[PDB]
CSV table of C-alpha atoms in Angstrom, one decimal:
chain,number,residue,atom,x,y,z
Q,134,UNK,CA,-95.9,10.1,60.2
Q,135,UNK,CA,-93.0,13.4,60.4
Q,136,UNK,CA,-94.9,14.5,63.2
Q,137,UNK,CA,-92.9,13.9,66.2
Q,138,UNK,CA,-89.4,15.1,64.1
Q,139,UNK,CA,-90.7,18.3,62.7
Q,140,UNK,CA,-91.6,19.0,66.4
Q,141,UNK,CA,-88.6,17.7,67.6
Q,142,UNK,CA,-86.2,19.5,64.8
Q,143,UNK,CA,-88.4,22.7,65.0
Q,144,UNK,CA,-87.8,22.7,68.9
Q,145,UNK,CA,-84.2,22.6,68.3
Q,146,UNK,CA,-84.3,25.6,65.6
Q,147,UNK,CA,-86.6,27.6,68.0
Q,148,UNK,CA,-84.1,27.2,70.7
Q,149,UNK,CA,-81.0,28.0,69.0
Q,150,UNK,CA,-81.7,30.3,66.6
Q,151,UNK,CA,-82.7,34.2,67.1
Q,152,UNK,CA,-86.4,35.8,67.0
Q,153,UNK,CA,-85.9,37.2,64.0
Q,154,UNK,CA,-82.8,35.3,61.8
Q,155,UNK,CA,-83.1,36.0,58.0
Q,156,UNK,CA,-84.6,33.0,55.8
Q,157,UNK,CA,-80.8,32.5,54.6
Q,158,UNK,CA,-80.3,31.8,58.6
Q,159,UNK,CA,-83.4,29.9,58.8
Q,160,UNK,CA,-81.9,27.9,55.7
Q,161,UNK,CA,-78.6,27.3,57.4
Q,162,UNK,CA,-79.6,26.0,60.8
Q,163,UNK,CA,-82.1,24.0,58.9
Q,164,UNK,CA,-80.2,21.9,57.0
Q,165,UNK,CA,-77.4,21.4,59.6
Q,166,UNK,CA,-79.9,20.9,62.8
Q,167,UNK,CA,-81.3,17.3,62.2
Q,168,UNK,CA,-77.5,16.4,63.4
Q,169,UNK,CA,-77.7,17.3,66.9
Q,170,UNK,CA,-81.5,15.3,67.4
Q,171,UNK,CA,-80.7,12.3,68.8
Q,172,UNK,CA,-79.3,9.4,66.3
Q,173,UNK,CA,-82.3,7.5,65.7
Q,174,UNK,CA,-83.8,10.7,64.1
Q,175,UNK,CA,-80.9,11.3,61.3
Q,176,UNK,CA,-82.0,9.6,58.1
Q,177,UNK,CA,-85.8,10.5,59.0
Q,178,UNK,CA,-84.7,13.9,60.1
Q,179,UNK,CA,-83.0,14.8,57.0
Q,180,UNK,CA,-86.1,13.1,54.9
Q,181,UNK,CA,-88.2,14.9,57.2
Q,182,UNK,CA,-86.3,18.2,56.2
Q,183,UNK,CA,-85.8,17.2,52.1
Q,184,UNK,CA,-89.5,16.8,51.3
Q,185,UNK,CA,-90.7,19.9,53.2
Q,186,UNK,CA,-87.4,22.6,53.1
Q,187,UNK,CA,-90.0,24.8,50.7
Q,188,UNK,CA,-92.6,25.7,53.5
Q,189,UNK,CA,-90.6,24.5,56.5
Q,190,UNK,CA,-88.2,28.3,55.9
Q,191,UNK,CA,-90.9,30.0,54.4
Q,192,UNK,CA,-93.5,29.5,57.6
Q,193,UNK,CA,-89.8,29.6,60.3
Q,194,UNK,CA,-89.5,33.2,59.2
Q,195,UNK,CA,-93.1,34.3,60.7
Q,196,UNK,CA,-93.3,31.6,63.8
Q,197,UNK,CA,-90.9,29.3,65.4
Q,198,UNK,CA,-93.1,27.2,68.0
Q,199,UNK,CA,-93.0,23.4,67.4
Q,200,UNK,CA,-96.1,22.2,68.0
Q,201,UNK,CA,-97.9,25.1,65.8
Q,202,UNK,CA,-95.0,24.7,62.9
Q,203,UNK,CA,-95.7,21.4,62.9
Q,204,UNK,CA,-99.3,21.7,62.9
Q,205,UNK,CA,-99.8,24.4,59.7
Q,206,UNK,CA,-97.2,22.0,57.3
Q,207,UNK,CA,-99.4,19.4,57.9
Q,208,UNK,CA,-96.8,16.9,59.0
Q,209,UNK,CA,-98.8,17.0,62.5
Q,210,UNK,CA,-102.4,15.5,61.2
S,37,UNK,CA,-86.7,8.0,46.4
S,38,UNK,CA,-86.6,9.4,50.1
S,39,UNK,CA,-87.6,5.2,51.6
S,40,UNK,CA,-85.5,3.3,49.0
S,41,UNK,CA,-82.3,4.0,50.6
S,42,UNK,CA,-83.7,2.4,54.1
S,43,UNK,CA,-86.2,0.0,51.8
S,44,UNK,CA,-83.4,-2.0,50.8
S,45,UNK,CA,-80.8,-1.6,54.0
S,46,UNK,CA,-84.5,-3.3,55.7
S,47,UNK,CA,-85.0,-5.8,53.1
S,48,UNK,CA,-81.3,-6.5,52.6
S,49,UNK,CA,-81.3,-7.6,56.2
S,50,UNK,CA,-84.0,-9.4,56.0
S,51,UNK,CA,-82.8,-11.2,52.8
S,52,UNK,CA,-79.7,-12.5,54.7
S,53,UNK,CA,-81.5,-14.0,58.0
S,54,UNK,CA,-84.7,-14.7,56.9
S,55,UNK,CA,-85.5,-18.2,55.0
S,56,UNK,CA,-87.1,-18.4,51.5
S,57,UNK,CA,-90.4,-20.5,52.0
S,58,UNK,CA,-91.2,-18.0,55.7
S,59,UNK,CA,-94.7,-17.8,56.0
S,60,UNK,CA,-96.3,-14.9,55.7
S,61,UNK,CA,-96.0,-14.8,59.6
S,62,UNK,CA,-93.0,-15.1,60.2
S,63,UNK,CA,-92.0,-12.2,57.6
S,64,UNK,CA,-94.4,-10.0,59.5
S,65,UNK,CA,-92.4,-10.5,63.2
S,66,UNK,CA,-89.5,-10.5,61.2
S,67,UNK,CA,-90.6,-7.1,59.7
S,68,UNK,CA,-91.3,-5.6,62.9
S,69,UNK,CA,-88.4,-6.0,64.6
S,70,UNK,CA,-86.0,-5.3,61.6
S,71,UNK,CA,-85.6,-1.7,62.0
S,72,UNK,CA,-83.5,-2.4,65.6
S,73,UNK,CA,-81.5,-4.0,63.3
S,74,UNK,CA,-79.9,-1.3,61.1
S,75,UNK,CA,-77.8,1.5,62.6
S,76,UNK,CA,-79.5,3.9,64.7
S,77,UNK,CA,-79.1,6.9,62.2
S,78,UNK,CA,-82.2,4.6,59.9
S,79,UNK,CA,-84.7,3.2,63.5
S,80,UNK,CA,-87.3,5.8,63.7
S,81,UNK,CA,-87.2,6.1,59.6
S,82,UNK,CA,-87.6,2.3,58.7
S,83,UNK,CA,-90.0,2.4,61.6
S,84,UNK,CA,-92.1,4.8,59.5
S,85,UNK,CA,-91.1,2.9,56.4
S,86,UNK,CA,-92.5,-0.2,57.8
S,87,UNK,CA,-95.5,1.5,58.8
S,88,UNK,CA,-96.1,2.7,55.7
S,89,UNK,CA,-95.5,-0.1,53.8
S,90,UNK,CA,-95.6,-3.0,55.5
S,91,UNK,CA,-99.0,-4.7,54.3
S,92,UNK,CA,-97.7,-4.7,51.0
S,93,UNK,CA,-94.7,-5.7,51.9
S,94,UNK,CA,-95.7,-9.0,53.3
S,95,UNK,CA,-98.2,-9.9,50.1
S,96,UNK,CA,-94.5,-9.4,47.8
S,97,UNK,CA,-92.0,-10.5,50.5
S,98,UNK,CA,-93.5,-14.4,50.5
S,99,UNK,CA,-92.5,-14.6,46.8
S,100,UNK,CA,-89.4,-13.1,46.7
S,101,UNK,CA,-86.8,-11.3,49.1
S,102,UNK,CA,-84.4,-9.4,47.0
S,103,UNK,CA,-83.7,-6.1,48.1
S,104,UNK,CA,-83.1,-3.8,45.0
S,105,UNK,CA,-86.3,-5.6,43.3
S,106,UNK,CA,-88.4,-5.4,46.3
S,107,UNK,CA,-88.0,-1.6,46.5
S,108,UNK,CA,-88.6,-0.6,43.3
S,109,UNK,CA,-91.9,-3.1,42.1
S,110,UNK,CA,-93.6,-1.7,46.0
S,111,UNK,CA,-92.5,2.0,45.0
S,112,UNK,CA,-90.0,2.5,46.9
S,113,UNK,CA,-87.2,3.2,45.0
S,114,UNK,CA,-86.1,3.9,42.4
């Protein structure tokens, strides 16, 4: 499913965003992050972000740990 | 609609490069290698689409391989 791409994208966000970024900044980064993942991921990534944006922003404000985040949103089962 | 675009590319690839009266085993084989021939940005999405729809993809691809119709019938599009 979306598990591995989720961890890769949230991994990017964690390393390249700051600890207390605004939902707005989380959104801007989230909608630009797929382009920095390895090429074979880029389309899968956009789909994941599209299906999951609402829940992703709601959780990333609290915590940006790739393993936890992807688990919580059900992306990693 | 999230798998719609990649469905059509993949079934499109198979439509051009596979013979009309191919066995299920040959289509299975084509299908599980097809993603590697799509543009790199589609690879992991294609792998996911295939894994998710493979049973019904084989079922239909023996009868018809038109990308637009096949993706409509299986629920990938539109």
